[PDB]
Swiss-Prot record, chain A:
GO molecular function (one): protein homodimerization activity
Protein name (database record): Mite allergen Der p 5
Coiled-coil regions, chain positions: none
UniProt region (Immunodominant conformational IgE-binding epitope), positions on chain: 3-22, 71-100
Keywords recorded for this protein, A-Z: Allergen
Included range, full protein: 34 to 131 of 132
Gene name of the encoded protein: DERP5
Species, as recorded: Dermatophagoides pteronyssinus
Amino acid sequence: NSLMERIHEQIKKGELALFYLQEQINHFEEKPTKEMKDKIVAEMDTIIAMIDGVRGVLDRLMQRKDLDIFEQYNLEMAKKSGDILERDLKKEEARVKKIE
Amino acid sequence: SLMERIHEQIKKGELALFYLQEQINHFEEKPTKEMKDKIVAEMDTIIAMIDGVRGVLDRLMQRKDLDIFEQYNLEMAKKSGDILERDLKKEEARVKKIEV
Amino acid sequence: NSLMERIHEQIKKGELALFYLQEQINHFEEKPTKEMKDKIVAEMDTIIAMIDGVRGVLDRLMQRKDLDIFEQYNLEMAKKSGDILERDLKKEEARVKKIEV
Amino acid sequence: NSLMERIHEQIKKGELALFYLQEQINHFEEKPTKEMKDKIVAEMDTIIAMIDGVRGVLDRLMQRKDLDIFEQYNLEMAKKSGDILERDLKKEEARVKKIEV
Amino acid sequence: NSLMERIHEQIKKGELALFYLQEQINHFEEKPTKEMKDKIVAEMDTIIAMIDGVRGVLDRLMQRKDLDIFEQYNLEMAKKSGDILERDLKKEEARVKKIEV
Amino acid sequence: NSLMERIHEQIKKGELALFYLQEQINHFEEKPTKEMKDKIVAEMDTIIAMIDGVRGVLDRLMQRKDLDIFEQYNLEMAKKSGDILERDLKKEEARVKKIEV
């Protein structure tokens, strides 16, 4: 386990939070409102803010000597995942701003 | 797609946690200074990631354009967040308090 | 909290579910889609079927002859509030069904 | 809306009703009497019975198709948290009966 | 309504308190305990305090010049009701206190 | 026994006092007059003054130390119902005054 299941449920929320953001964008495109843009953009800057600090924490943990071939892999995957997401966010966010 | 990749990446994050658990299980068998140092170092990183997300929630829970449903969903995520982080912190202390 | 803490938030969810329904109806009047009509109605019938079930349970408890005046009061209020909510639901569901779509 | 304003007030009343039950259990432990246990158990069996009526409600919805991602997830948690809540209730009730008088 | 029905409810609240009080005293007489006595005395003191406060308001109102025969009578009755209630409450309070625990 | 009965009828008086007022306002519209207007004004004024005074008393009571959640809630509701009532009174009176007489 339950100790692990707890974390999983918490992570699943973040995933659904992205789906929701995607829905907000969809609703925005339909009926564009400056008020909604302010919301979406802020939220996107929020997610990016977290990833920024998170990446740092990872870069530090990877500079250890204990990490084995398996542990090293996981960290590299998490670091890359954050990169992929943050890139696809700033790219998407920039598009929203371009929407008149 | 992106969401298809986010889900795939998230699944890997789960498998990573199950591995950490097995190294804790292995540590209960042969409590050593080396493994303990690694585990603790990894538990710190995880807790930090949560503590970080915790700070992101607060920044959002201050806006005005938040309907009752969004506010509630966040308050729940934060309440649950503090619970999970509190459970992990107590779990780490139990690890840092073991002899060889 | 203990059980009361959980029971409380559990009831809080019910309150939100209502406001959520209000939104379904509020937006339904904007674009009367029969696809949503069949959906909303189903939800209302579910809640009503739940209330009707709760009443039967409240009636059995009120049958006891060892409840203090305050306990009797709370049971009457609970049953009454349920009776009120069901009135407004059936009167609203009837109006919704009238909207062609 | 006055209705939701009244429902909200009723929730506050029901909240006090639950806390009042808490006190009953407290004093019950202090001075364990048979007659009190009977009423407390009956009151909890009622609270549990209501939850059983909630599950049959959720299940009926969790089978529906026109539910989206968010709606389906919200109910799924309500059912899980509901099961745990009810489970904890039955456990709390057992502890009460165990207190012989 | 959403007003007169709400008022109707808040009115019955006063009677509920008194009825509940009479039950507390009854239960106390059956099983006297310092905990309950102190609780009953505290409640009565508060209720009495409310009567004393209200009496002041009623007296100030009687001074009004634009009062007709009706409004004036209603005040006298409301004033006498408090006089009776407080007179009986104090007698019951003195009696309860004298009960050995 | 005669006390509770007296308090009960003392309750229905305050209830009728508002309905009787509502009827006064009704007939007034049918045939406006500077006399009924001055009377109604004084009537609605006195009631408002009462609510004001009672609130002040309710504020003092809440400052007591031996109060419990149930006593605090009763006071809160008593003060709340006083606000709503007076609110409609102040508004309604305005509508009454702005009537061509």
